[PDB]
Design a protein around this ligand. Structure first.
Ligand SMILES: Nc1ncnc2c1ncn2[C@@H]1O[C@H](COP(=O)(O)OP(=O)(O)O)[C@@H](O)[C@H]1O
Ligand SMILES: Nc1ncnc2c1ncn2[C@@H]1O[C@H](COP(=O)(O)OP(=O)(O)O)[C@@H](O)[C@H]1O
Ligand SMILES: Nc1ncnc2c1ncn2[C@@H]1O[C@H](COP(=O)(O)OP(=O)(O)O)[C@@H](O)[C@H]1O
Ligand SMILES: Nc1ncnc2c1ncn2[C@@H]1O[C@H](COP(=O)(O)OP(=O)(O)O)[C@@H](O)[C@H]1O
Lengths: 439, 459, 78, 36, 437, 449
C-alpha cells in the first residue's frame, strides 16, 4: 500500500560527484544533509571504517526519517539495516545492556557460501517398507531422466518427506540432497482412472534431460545474532524468532568473534558490515550511553546513524540538561548533521510528489491554498488534507479536487495550531491537573 | 442431554445500546436525531470521512484524535464507527492501561494489538470424503509379488452419509491409517485429497446399543454430503499468524507437550519474524489469493500511554502495513506520564501530535439533553410523562449528562413498585435523594465532614 | 497426553454444515478453543496457502542453512 | 521374506501392497482379510 | 466447625419489605439505616431483574457506620442463584498478572452461565469380573437393593485392565462419555485384607437403582470458561492459580459462543454483583480501565465502598473527593450513610449480645451505650466478649457494671490511645530520636 | 581488516629500563601514565597478586582505554583479560554481585592436561540383551549390549550399560556407523558410514570416512585452557553424563543463576587438587571495569569482600568524572564517583591532557594507520581543529575528507576537502550554538524543549 515513505526511491545523488540534485528520487528540497548522508553512505559501502556515530539533528517534520529511508532504499537487500526504535530496548525479559548488544550484533551480516546437491527427473517407482506399531522404515526410489536410470536408497527422513509430499509414480521432483526438501514440479503422464483420492492434475512437463546429481553453490546471509543464538543453546533453537533468548554469556561471544575471524581468513565467510538506525535516541537514558560509547571500539561494530528532535533537554535517569538530551561525553564521539526547515517553493513540490503518489489529481488554486496551509501547519497536516480532500471529492462525485474540498477538510479536521487554542479556550470542561465541571 | 428452556430471548441495556450508526446522508452531511445520536454534526461528518477512508483501503498508517471533555461522546463515535464498518473488518478496542504487562515490555503489547487490528481473508477449497464406514473389503492383485502372502491392489471402502452412500476404490496405502487409528465398521471418518490418510472421528449413533457398557463418544451420522467440494472463506488476524509461528501449537515430543501443558507465556517477538510475515503476505496478495483488510485500533484513554510508548508508535505507524489508530483523549494541558517535564496538550507529545487528524467534540446544548433522554428512555422501554422529561433535563443541564441517564432505572423500579406503569415527577423526585450525584456528595463531604475525628471522614 | 487422539479438531472438518448447527458433544462443551481452530481447517485444504503461513518459522530456519552450518561455539567445561 | 515389514510398491501400472505370510495370523491381517 | 462468630454474623439478609420497599427498622439483624437500605433495596431489585447492565454504585460515609454490613445484607438476600464477589482492592496488585487483567477477571467472575441437563450415571459395586478368553465379557454389579449382569464387548475390558478393577470396588460409569471412575472399596471387604495400601479409601455401598438419571442445574461463571480454555489441562489452574495474562482472542471467542448459546436456548445468562471493597486503594491506572469495562453487555452491576474524604489519589498527586478521580465520579451514583443515634446503638449492642449468647443487665447495657457513643461501635462491640469472659473468670452468670468497667479499664479505646501517644512522645519512635530513659 | 578507533595502539612502547620513550608503538607522549601501566603489567606477570586496585583517572578524550588495550596487547594471548563496563552488570535474572563475581572468575585462567579414552571403532554387531522386568508399569528395559567395534588392527567385542546404550540410541547408530565412545562422559558421536558400505547411488548425504587406523582402544592427551567461571557453570548447570538431570537440563532454556559461596569454594579445592598432582597451571588475569562511576554503592560495597579473597584478579578501574554524586546514595559526593572508603585501595594513575604538537603526531599516526595520505597544511588545519574543538573530533574529519578527495579525482587530501568536510559534518559545540540561536521559540519551526 501507500505508507508515509513509499514515494522515496533512494537518496538521489550523483555516483561520480555525489552532488545533491534539487529534485531527484522523492527526496526533494534539501541539499546539505543529503550530501552528507551520501558521504556516510559511501563510507558504509566501503566497509572498511568501523565504529562511527552520525546524529541527524533538526526540527521535527523536516525529513530525517526520510533521509534514513533514502539510505535504506539505496543499499538494497544485501547489507543489513536495523530500524531500531529507542524504546524497544527497555525489556523485562533481558537486561537493558544486552538488548543493545543484540541490536549491534544484528547489523553485522555474515555471508557464507555452501554447496548443495540437487536432483532432477521423473520418478518411476516408490518402494516403502514399514513396520507395524512403531519402527524403522526402508526405501528404494527408482528415478529416470532421458539418460540415466538410478535405483537410490532412502532413510527415515526421506520417507517422512515422501509421504508428506505424496510422491506417486510419474512425478517430476527435485530433491536437494543436503537439505532434504521435495518440490514437485509436475507430471509427465495423466491422472489414473482407478483410484478416487488421487488429487489435482498438475502442470504437464516433459522428462528432464541432463544428469541426476547436479551441484549448486548457494549463498546464505545470517546476522551475528543468529549465530549467537544457534551456538548458545543445545536444543532450544527457534528462540531467535520467538524472542525467548534470555541471556548470552560473554564466553559465547568471545568464541564466536574468533571463529568468524577464522572464517574470514579461510575464505569461507565474508563480513558485510551494516547500519544500525536508532530512531529518536533521546529516549535512552544514561545507562545506555555508557555502553553505546564503548561498543563502538571494536572491529565488529556497525556504523550507527541516529535521529533526534529535542533542544536543551534533560537526560533521562539523571538530573541535568544537555543539548539534544545526549551527554557531553557521548557528544564528542558523534558527528552532528543539521537539517533545516523548509521553504514554500519546496513544500509545493513535496506536496506535488505526495499527491502524485497517492493518485490524487489537483487544480492549481487548490494546490496554492494547500501550500498556504502547509506554511502554517507543516507537511503532516497537509498530506492528511490531500487524502481527505480526495475522498470528499469522491463523495460528491467530482473528478479533480478543488478549493471547496480543501476548505471542507480544513473545517472538519483541525491542525494542532487550532487544537491548542481549542484547549486554551474551554479549560473548564477538560481535565487538567485539577478538577473539572459539567456545565 | 442439555434441556432447552423456552423463555424470552431479550438483550441487556448497556450505556451505548441506542447507538446504531452514524446516520449520515448520501452526501456526507450529518442530520440531527438519526440512528441514536442527537446533534454533534461536525464530529459525525468527520467520522463518516474516517469510515470512508477505512473502507476505501487508502489508509495505511494514519492517526485520528478525538478531543473533547468527559461525557461528550467519543466512545459513542467509536462504537458508531465499529457498527458502521460491520463485522468483517476488525476492531480492537484496547485502553491505555492495558499495555502495562508483567511478562513483556510495554512497547510490545502495542505491536500485538496492531496485529490484532489487521485481518487477512483467505479463500480456499476443501475436498473430503466423508461419513460412516460400511465395508472394508480388499481386492487381490493381478500379479502377486513372489515371496509374500496376500497382495492387494485396491482397497474398497463403502462410505454412507446421511443423504446417500457410495462405494470408494482407494490406493492400498490407507492401511497404515486404519491400523493406527483403529477404524472399524460403524466409525465415521474423513478422507482428505492432498494426502489421503483417514482419521476416525467416532463410533456412530446407530451402533450405540449393540453393546451395553462399552461406551465412548457416540457421534451422529454426518448430515450433509459424502463428497464435499466446498469453498471456504477464512479470516485470520496477523496476531494469530505471529503466535502460531512463534509458539507452535501442536507438537509430538515431551517439551512441546509441556509447553502447551504449562501456562502460555506472552513472549516478545523479534522483528525478523514480522518482516518475513509481511514479505510473504505481500507475496500472496500479489498472487491473488489473500486479501488484506486493515482495521481500527481504538486506543481509548490515550493519556495513559506514557512517553515511552509514542516513540514506539512512531516506528509502528511508519510501517507499510498498519491499521488506523483512533485515539481518545479528554485532557487539556496535562503532564505526560513518562517524562515529568513538558506540559503538553491532551497528554500527547508535540512530536506525535502532528501526525493526528484532530477531531473536536463539543458540549451539548440544553435542549438536546432532553432528546437524548427521550431516546434512552424509549431504548430501555421506560416510559414517562413530559414533566418528568423536563425535570430529568433540568438535572441534566444543571449537574451532568451521565447523571440524568442514570435516574431512569431507579425511577422505573420505584414506579413499578408503587403500583404504576409510567414514571411521573414524584418517582424521580423520590429517586433523586436515594442516589446523590458527585456534587452533593462533595458538599456533604466538606460541610458535614469537617475534620478527622470520631464521626468524620479520613482525609 | 502423548497417547490421546485429538478429535475435536476433526469435528470442524466433518460436522461443518449450516444445517448441522455447529454440533459439539455435551461432555466436551466448554472446550471451545479446542473446537474452533483454524489450524485444523488449514491442514485439509487443497492449496496449502495457510499451511505456508502457520509454520514459516521452520521454513525460514531451514532455508538460511542454520542446520548445516558448523557449530562455532561450545561450552569450555562440562 | 521379512518378518514384520509390509511392502508398498507403486509403478506406472498400479500400486500393490505385499504382506509377509508370517503376519497373516496376527492382528495385522484383519484389514488385509486374514485376521486371527 | 469452621464457622465462628465474626463481626458479620447477625446480618441474615437485607431486611426490607419485598412489596412496597419499606425498610422496617429491626428486621433480619440490620437496625435503623432506612434511606441507605431503601436505596440498596432498589439496587437489589434492579439486580434480580438483570436487564440493566453495568451501573456503578458507591457507598460513601464515615467509618463504623455500616458500609460492609449493607453489602453483606445484599449478599445474603440474593441466594446461591445470582453470584457475588468479595474483592478488596489490595488483591489486584499482583506480581504474576498485571492490574488490568487481574481486574478483568473480577468482572469475568460475576456473570454466570446456567444450564440444565440429565446425568446418566451408573453407580455400583463389582461382584465378579467374567472375561471370556475366546472379544466379550460380563460384568456383575450390585447395590443394596438390586444386582445385574451387563454385557461388554471389546474395549472397556481394556479400560478395566488399565484401571485394575478387582472384585469389591465401587465403580462409576458416565454412560454419556464411557469412562470408568473407581471410587474406592467397600466396608464389606475391610475384613478381607490386613495391611491396606495407600490409595484405598473405604465407602458404603451404592443405594437404589443402578441407572440413575437426574436433572441437575449447572451454574458456571465466564471466568471458569476463560480459565479452562487457557491451556490443555488447564482446569486445575483455577484451583491452583497458575494462570497469567490470558489473550483477548480467547475471551472474544468465549463471548461469541456464550451469545450463540443464548440464541440456541442452551444457556441462560445470569448477571451478578461485583463488590469492590475499599475502592480508594485503586490507582488511576485502574480507574482508566473501569471506565471502559462498564460499557460492554457483559458487565456486572458494580457495588463499591469507600471511606476517605478529600484525599489524594494513589498514583498521582492531586486531591479529589472520596479518593476517586472526577471522570469516574461523573459515572457512579452515591448512597451516603449517617452516624448512629444512641437509640440505635443500644439495640445494635443488644443484637451483638444475642448473637454471642451473652446476657446483659440493663445497667451494663446503658453503660455500654455510653461507651459506644463516646468511642464508637467497634470498641463497644469488643467489650461484650471481654466482659463475658471476665464474668466467666469470677463465675457470674450475668455481666454487670463491674465487668464492663473492668474491661474499659484494661483495654483502651482509640480515643485515649492518641492521648497516650502524645502524652509520652520522648520514648515512642516518632521519626528521629528515642530517649530510652 | 577494519580500522577501528584503536588500531594504531600496539603496546606501551617501553625501554629495557622501564622508561617510556615518547612517540613509540602507537602512543604519543603520555609518560607518567605509560610507566605506571608498565609497572602494572609486570605486577600481573609476577603472580604475587591477589587483588590490587588500579584507577585510571583523567578527563574524557585523554586515552584511558588506549592504555587498557596497550596492557591487553602487552600481556599476551595466554593471560586472561576481561573487559566490561559499568552498565553491563545490571541484569534481570541475577543480582549484580553475581555478575561481578562471574567476571572475577572469568578473569582467572587454568591450563589443564587431560587424558581422553576414546574407543574408536566401526560397529559390527549391535544386539540388545534385556533383563527381567516384572509388573512395575514401565515394561521391559534394555540392560546389556554386545556392540562389536572393528578398527584396522584388532577388533574388540564389548558390553555396555543402559546409559551408554541410550547415548548410542540418541545418536541413531545403525550397523556400519563408525563411532567413538568417549569414556569420560559417555557421549558417542556418529561420524559416518564406513567405506566398506560405500555406494555412489545414495541419497542420505552421508559422510563416508575410512576405518580408523590404530588400536580400537586409543588414549590421547590434550591441553585445555579453562577459566574458573567455566568450571562454575559446568558444576552449576550439568550438561555432561547420561543421566536425566544432565539430559533434561540441555533441552530447557539456559538461565544465568546465582552460583553460591559453597560451589566457589569447592571448585577452588578441586583446582588445588589438580595443581598438587602436577597437571594444571594457574594464570591470574585482569578485570578491566571501564566507566566505574556507573557502578552504584551496592557494588563498591561488594568489591571489598571480592578483593579480600586469597584468589582474586587485579582490578583496573576507569573513571572520567570529577567531583560527582555516587549513583546509589545521592547524599554523599566524592571524587570520580568512587566512594571515599573504597578509594583508599586504589593506586590512582592520573592522565593529563595533550599539547598542540602531540595532537599533530596523533593525527599523523591515525592518517597513516587508516590509509589516508595528505599534505602538511591539511595536517596543520586538522591540528587547529584539534586544539580548538576536541581531540576525537578532528580525527573523525579524515574519513569524509578522503571520500571527498576521491570525488575530485585526487589522491592526497588538500585544504579544500577538509574545508568542505568541516561544513558538511559538524561538532557538538557549534550544533548547540545553532540550537540555542535558531531554536528561539517552540512552535512549527522550533525544537521540542
Ligand atoms: N525532503 C523530503 N522529501 C520527500 N519527503 C519528505 C521530505 N521531507 C519530509 N518529507 C515527508 O514528510 C514526512 C515527515 O518526514 P519525517 O522524516 O517523518 O519527519 P520527522 O523527521 O520529523 O519524523 C515524511 O512522511 C516524508 O514523506
Ligand atoms: N450524541 C449523542 N447522542 C446520544 N447519546 C450520547 C451522545 N453523546 C453521548 N451520549 C451518551 O453520553 C454517555 C457518556 O458519553 P461518553 O461516550 O461516556 O463520553 P466520553 O466518550 O467522553 O467517555 C454515553 O452513555 C452516551 O450514551
Ligand atoms: N444498621 C445496623 N444494624 C446492626 N449492626 C450494624 C448496622 N450497621 C452496622 N452494623 C455493624 O457495625 C459494624 C461496622 O460496619 P462496617 O460496614 O464494617 O463499617 P465500615 O463501613 O467502617 O467498615 C459491622 O460489623 C456491623 O455488624
Ligand atoms: N597517546 C595517544 N596516542 C594516540 N592516540 C590517542 C592517545 N591518547 C588518546 N588517543 C586517542 O583518543 C581516542 C579516544 O581515547 P579514549 O581512551 O577512548 O578516551 P577516554 O580516555 O575518554 O576513553 C582514541 O581513538 C585514541 O586514538
Amino acid at each position: 500500500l501507500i505508507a508515509a515513505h513509499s514515494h522515496i526511491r533512494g537518496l538521489g545523488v550523483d555516483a561520480d560527484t555525489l552532488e545533491p540534485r534539487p529534485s531527484s528520487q522523492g527526496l526533494v528540497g534539501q541539499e546539505k544533509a543529503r550530501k552528507a548522508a551520501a558521504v556516510v553512505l559511501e563510507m558504509i559501502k566501503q566497509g572498511k571504517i568501523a565504529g562511527r556515530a552520525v546524529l541527524i539533528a533538526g526540527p521535527p517534520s523536516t525529513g530525517k526519517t526520510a533521509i534514513a529511508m533514502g539510505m535504506a532504499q539505496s543499499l538494497g537487500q544485501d547489507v543489513p539495516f536495523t530500524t531500531l526504535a529507542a524504546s524497544e530496548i527497555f525489556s523485562l525479559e533481558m537486561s537493558k545492556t544486552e538488548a543493545l548488544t543484540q541490536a549491534f550484533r544484528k547489523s553485522i551480516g555474515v555471508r557464507i557460501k555452501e554447496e548443495s546437491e540437487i536432483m532432477e527427473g521423473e520418478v518411476v517407482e516408490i518402494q516403502i517398507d514399514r513396520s507395524v506399531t512403531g519402527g524403522a522404515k526402508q526405501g528404494k526410489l527408482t528415478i529416470k531422466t532421458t539418460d540415466m536410470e538410478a535405483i537410490y536408497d532412502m532413510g527415515s527422513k526421506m520417507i517422512d518427506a515422501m509421504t508428506k509430499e505424496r510422491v506417486m509414480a510419474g512425478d517430476i521432483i527435485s530433491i536437494d540432497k543436503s537439505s532434504g526438501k521435495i518440490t514437485k514440479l509436475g507430471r509427465s503422464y495423466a491422472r489414473s482412472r482407478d483410484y478416487d483420492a488421487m488429487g489435482v492434475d498438475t502442470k504437464f512437463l516433459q522428462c528432464p534431460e541432463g544428469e541426476l546429481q547436479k551441484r549448486k553453490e548457494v549463498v546464505h546471509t545470517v546476522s551475528l545474532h543468529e549465530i549467537d543464538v544457534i551456538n548458545s543453546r543445545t536444543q532450544g533453537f527457534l528462540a531467535l524468532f520467538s524472542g525467548d533468548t534470555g541471556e548470552i554469556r560473554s564466553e559465547i561471544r568471545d568464541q564466536i568473534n574468533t571463529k568468524v575471524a577464522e572464517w574470514k581468513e579461510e575464505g569461507k565467510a565474508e563480513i558485510v558490515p551494516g547500519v544500525l538506525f536508532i530512531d529518536e535516541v533521546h529516549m535512552l537514558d544514561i545507562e545506555c550511553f555508557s555502553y553505546i560509547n564503548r561498543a563502538l571500539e571494536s572491529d565488529l561494530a556497525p556504523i550507527v546513524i541516529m535521529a533526534s528532535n529535542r533542544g536543551v533537554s534533560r537526560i533521562r535517569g539523571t538530573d541535568y540538561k544537555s543539548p539534544h538530551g545526549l551527554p557531553l561525553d557521548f557528544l564528542d564521539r558523534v558527528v552532528i548533521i543539521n537539517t533545516h526547515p523548509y521553504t514554500p517553493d519546496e513544500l509545493r513540490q513535496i506536496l506535488s510528489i505526495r499527491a502524485q503518489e497517492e493518485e490524487v489529481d489537483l487544480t492549481p488554486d487548490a494546490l496554492a491554498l494547500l501550500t498556504k496551509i502547509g506554511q502554517e501547519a507543516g507537511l503532516r497536516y497537509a498530506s492528511n488534507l490531500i487524502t481527505t480532500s480526495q475522498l470528499i471529492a469522491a463523495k460528491r462525485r467530482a473528478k479533480q479536487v478543488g478549493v471547496e474540498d480543501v476548505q471542507r477538510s480544513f473545517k472538519l479536521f483541525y491542525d494542532p495550531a487550532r487544537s491548542v487554542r481549542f484547549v486554551q479556550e474551554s479549560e473548564k470542561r477538560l481535565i487538567g491537573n485539577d478538577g473539572v465541571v459539567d456545565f | 442431554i442439555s434441556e432447552v428452556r423456552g423463555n424470552t430471548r431479550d438483550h441487556r441495556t448497556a450505556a451505548h445500546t441506542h447507538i446504531k450508526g452514524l446516520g449520515l446522508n448520501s452526501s456526507g452531511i450529518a442530520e440531527k436525531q438519526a440512528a441514536g445520536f442527537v446533534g454533534q454534526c461536525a464530529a459525525r461528518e468527520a467520522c463518516g470521512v474516517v469510515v470512508d477512508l477505512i473502507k476505501a483501503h487508502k489508509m495505511a498508517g494514519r492517526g485520528v484524535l478525538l478531543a473533547g471533555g468527559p461525557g461528550t461522546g467519543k466512545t459513542a463515535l467509536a462504537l458508531a464507527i465499529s457498527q458502521e464498518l460491520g463485522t468483517k473488518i476488525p476492531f480492537c478496542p484496547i485502553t491505555g492501561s492495558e499495555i502495562y504487562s508483567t511478562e513483556v515490555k510495554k512497547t510490545e503489547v502495542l505491536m500485538e494489538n496492531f496485529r490484532r487490528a489487521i485481518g487477512l481473508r483467505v479463500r480456499e477449497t476443501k475436498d473430503v470424503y466423508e461419513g460412516e464406514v460400511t465395508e472394508m473389503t480388499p481386492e487381490e492383485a493381478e500379479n502377486p509379488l513372489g515371496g509374500y502372502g496376500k497382495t492387494i491392489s485396491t482397497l474398497l471402502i463403502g462410505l454412507k452419509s446421511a443423504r446417500g452412500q457410495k462405494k470408494l476404490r482407494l490406493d492400498p496405502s490407507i492401511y497404515e491409517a486404519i491400523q493406527k487409528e483403529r477404524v472399524q465398521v460403524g466409525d465415521v471418518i474423513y478422507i482428505e485429497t492432498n494426502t489421503g490418510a483417514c482419521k476416525r472421528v467416532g463410533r456412530s449413533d446407530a451402533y450405540a446399543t449393540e453393546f451395553d457398557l462399552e461406551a465412548e463418544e457416540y457421534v451422529p451420522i454426518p448430515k450433509g454430503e459424502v463428497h464435499k467440494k466446498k469453498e471456504i472463506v477464512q479470516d485470520v488476524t496477523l496476531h494469530d499468524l505471529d503466535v502460531a509461528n512463534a509458539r507452535p501449537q501442536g507438537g509430538q515430543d515431551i517439551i512441546s507437550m509441556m509447553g502447551q501443558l504449562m501456562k502460555p507465556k506472552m513472549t516478545e517477538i523479534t522483528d525478523k519474524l514480522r518482516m518475513e510475515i509481511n514479505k510473504v503476505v505481500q507475496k500472496y496478495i500479489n498472487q491473488g489469493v489473500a486479501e488484506l483488510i486493515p482495521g481500527v485500533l481504538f486506543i481509548d484513554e490515550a493519556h495513559m500511554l506514557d512517553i515511552e510508548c509514542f516513540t514506539y508508535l512512531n516506528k509502528a505507524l511508519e510501517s507499510p502495513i498498519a491499521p488506523i489508530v483512533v485515539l481518545a483523549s479528554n485532557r487539556g494541558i496535562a503532564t505526560i506520564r513518562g517524562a515529568d517535564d513538558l506540559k503538553a496538550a491532551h497528554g500527547i507529545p508535540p512530536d506525535f501530535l502532528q501526525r493526528l487528524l484532530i477531531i473536536p467534540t463539543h458540549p451539548y446544548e440544553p435542549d438536546e439533553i432532553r432528546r437524548i433522554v427521550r431516546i434512552r428512555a424509549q431504548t430501555e422501554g421506560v416510559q414517562l410523562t413530559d414533566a418528568a422529561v423536563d425535570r430529568v433535563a433540568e438535572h441534566g443541564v444543571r449537574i451532568s449528562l451521565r447523571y440524568c441517564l442514570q435516574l431512569l432505572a431507579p425511577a422505573s423500579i420505584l414506579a413499578r413498585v408503587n403500583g404504576r406503569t409510567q414514571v411521573d415527577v414524584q418517582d424521580i423526585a423520590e429517586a433523586e435523594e436515594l442516589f446523590l450525584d458527585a456534587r452533593r456528595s462533595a458538599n456533604i463531604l466538606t460541610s458535614t465532614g469537617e475534620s478527622g475525628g470520631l464521626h468524620g471522614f479520613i482525609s | 497426553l502423548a497417547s490421546k487422539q485429538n478429535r475435536l479438531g476433526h469435528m470442524q472438518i466433518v460436522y461443518d454444515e449450516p444445517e448441522d448447527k455447529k454440533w459439539t458433544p455435551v461432555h466436551a462443551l466448554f472446550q471451545i478453543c479446542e473446537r474452533e481452530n483454524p489450524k485444523a481447517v488449514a491442514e485439509i485444504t487443497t492449496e496449502g496457502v495457510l499451511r505456508d503461513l502457520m509454520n514459516i518459522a521452520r521454513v525460514k530456519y531451514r532455508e538460511l542453512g542454520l542446520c548445516r552450518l558448523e557449530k562455532a561455539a561450545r561450552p569450555r567445561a562440562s | 521374506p521379512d518378518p514384520m515389514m509390509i511392502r508398498w510398491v507403486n509403478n506406472k501400472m498400479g500400486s500393490v501392497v505385499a504382506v509377509p505370510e508370517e503376519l497373516l495370523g496376527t492382528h495385522a491381517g484383519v484389514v488385509f482379510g486374514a485376521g486371527p
